[PDB]
Amino acid sequence: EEDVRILGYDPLASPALLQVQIPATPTSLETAKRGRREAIDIITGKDDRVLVIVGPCSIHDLEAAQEYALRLKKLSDELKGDLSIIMRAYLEKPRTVGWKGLINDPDVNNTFNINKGLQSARQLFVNLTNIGLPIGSEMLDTISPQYLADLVSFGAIGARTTESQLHRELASGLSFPVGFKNGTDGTLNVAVDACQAAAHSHHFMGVTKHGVAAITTTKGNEHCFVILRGGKKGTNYDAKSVAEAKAQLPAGSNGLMIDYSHGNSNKDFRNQPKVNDVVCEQIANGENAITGVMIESNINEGNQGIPAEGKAGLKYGVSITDACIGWETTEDVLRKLAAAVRQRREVNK
Template identity: 55%
Template sequence: MNTLQSNPLTQSDIDNVNIKSFQPLVTPAELKTELPLTETAYQTVLHGRETIRNILDGKDKRLFVVIGPCSIHDPVAAHEYADRLKVLSEKVKDSLYIVMRVYFEKPRTTVGWKGLINDPDMNDSFNIEKGLRLGRKLLLELNEKGLPCATEALDPNSPQYYQDLISWSAIGARTTESQTHREMSSGLSSPVGFKNGTDGGLTVATNAMQSVKH
């Protein structure tokens, strides 16, 4: 029997042939140690999740509203938006419960910028570690303002870095039917919403909710 050592071919001829390079990332535990959850942020998330669950269960009669940019690209602009949204949320708090949309990842039908985490500098440098750090820092600061946050759970690894700062998670139209995302959703700590399929139908979303329950 020929072994790899006696064969002129090497493992590189058949393994990772479409991978250009590897870049180790900071671990979720390391990033959480660097940017730890504060007491104020903790209380914002805890209250946000409880309120959303009460609304979905019919115990709180207010309308639950997720509102904000399609995708975050500039933390400074996000803070400006958040400050204005916080003022508005106080004005309408008796009838609306407002949660800020803080989406860091963009699913693409073909190609395009995939969001702050994937390419924070928007120049195809794909500094994912920088993106994860920026994302967690921004979420911490928004929760410190007392503003609950929502995001789309797209990359199955990302929630480990900042799910503790999320009051509501979304599964988008392109991933609602994905078994991987259904399994991930069943383990998320926040309430989760499923979008209709790309064809506009609701069956995919209702099937996903049934699947995630098990």
Template identity: 50%
Template sequence: MCSTSDLHVVETRPLVPPSLLHQELPLAPHTAESIQAARRRIQAILRGEDRRLLVIVGPCSVHDVDAAREYADRLLPVRQRHAEDLEVVMRVYFEKPRTTVGWKGLINDPHLDGSYDINTGLRRARGLLLHLAGCGLPAATELLDPVVPQYIADLISWTAIGARTTESQTHREMASGLSMPIGYKNGTDGSAAIAINAMQAASRPHHFLGINHEGHASIVTTTGNPDGHLVLRGGKQGPNYSPEAVTAAARQLEAAGLTPRLMVDCSHGNSNKDYRRQGEVLASVAAQVADGSDAVLGVMLESHLVAGSQGLGSDPVSLSYGQSITDACIDFETTEALLDQLSAAVRGSRSRQAVLT
């Protein structure tokens, strides 16, 4: 008999059900309360009720759980030191969208060898997030595959919908059911219109195909997620972090009936893909904050233990410890200095406001 299906499929493997993974790596009640509290603080920042800045900082992607834990150990005291000015959330990205092909992230290929042991990847990702939550360090990620949230979303305090997926109906539907605040990045062309459309779409109820907690195919019905915001990350037309660009984007948000506050991604198009220029972007944002701008709610930084990046190559054992295998990052010492600068800007803005009032 002539087959008409699965002509390009060579294998299917069982995926661990979300419920089983949650049983193996459970979320304790006190940890759940900590995550909920972090989400509430972020919501307050988005709405302008909390005048601190939200900072999403960490590796471009996690490929080594031990290095990620060490990074978290170093970030935690910095977070605590700046708690009055900044809500510091660790960037913990497990999925990587690829322009063509390449390593797709810890969940997809945890052994870095093309074996695609996704069940192990999900366990490592959830285990790391539980560790961070237990330490009191909120976590942020980008959710790419719409199946993944069932496995880890209960441990995430903030998530991103990336420039390549903000226009996707599948991701807008997924976002409408997520339980945490979401940043929508502007399109790769630099336009904010696509992200604004996504914010509006995801704030509405949706019905779509998905999986439930047991891993069964399901019809998912959502209420809509009201806690979305714009992330300016630059684009093909150049950076968009200047005071003029921020003001223009805030006006677009206001015209769409949305809160005119946004985040600036210091990497990607805004740094012209040169990790060393993230400091220039942050300096501009810090100056805007110090001058009293209400439009900026936070920043994103790509940062790791060691500066730069390295190729994955054919031998994962030979990789340098603590250095990115995707986008290049600033090192931790530089990161700490930049957060000091941003914290000072928040204090300056607070002092300026006190004088005016």
């Protein structure tokens, strides 16, 4: 007696199969490799620029996500001297009611279609990296990465998974930098331990490119950093917290990342520009522990819901999960930030 709570198994196209059906262009693969290099240099102290993971809370519209990417691309060219921008192309959010994500519900209609979900996911990632814009995503499980890893330049383990052994081992084998968010209870200890663990070699059970379960063995990831995203103990994007933080980072730690939205906003997306100001000062005055910022942005501000009128009737450019600043304001943030960096170069010059 088992599976009594298992309604059934549906066939799942393997990674290898998907990687052929939706191939990565030479440009796409190049953009991904570049992003990883830049990201690595910045978090390890080799580059004085600031790593910026900015983009929608979650993509549900490949059309709108492509428009946004173009804009963000044209900008990244201009502020490339001070900011290395990776676009947020998260494929969901850890809901509890609400949507499931571009992979669980690609059609936004409670009609699960994982296979089509993975196709959209992969297609999307290819479309974005194809125009020369690196992308970052959240590492949900130990399988999804196999279908998209080749195109990702940055990966972030959510706040509710940083303590999870399973996600630490997963990070210890990813081919890019992985950011661990601090505990949902404001503490920074668990994220420091995640980075410690991901640095080691692990032996876990995963699936191959051919959809088969196998004993995986990782090398260890040394490009794991901490992301500050607030918590119960209050937001932590300020100098005082940044210092408490630096104080906890062990020997050989990488540069800290500060997520403007989420716990560092207190259910008010209009606080991101505020945080930017505070963080931009620390930077403008020689703070070199602050290496990257995480921004939840979009084409139009705010959030919304999934109307009774199916997907066909959803305000365009507007998130359907966490709320975010709109384009206009995003470019501001990125210009004061671009300055905070250009400045910083002197404080240390």
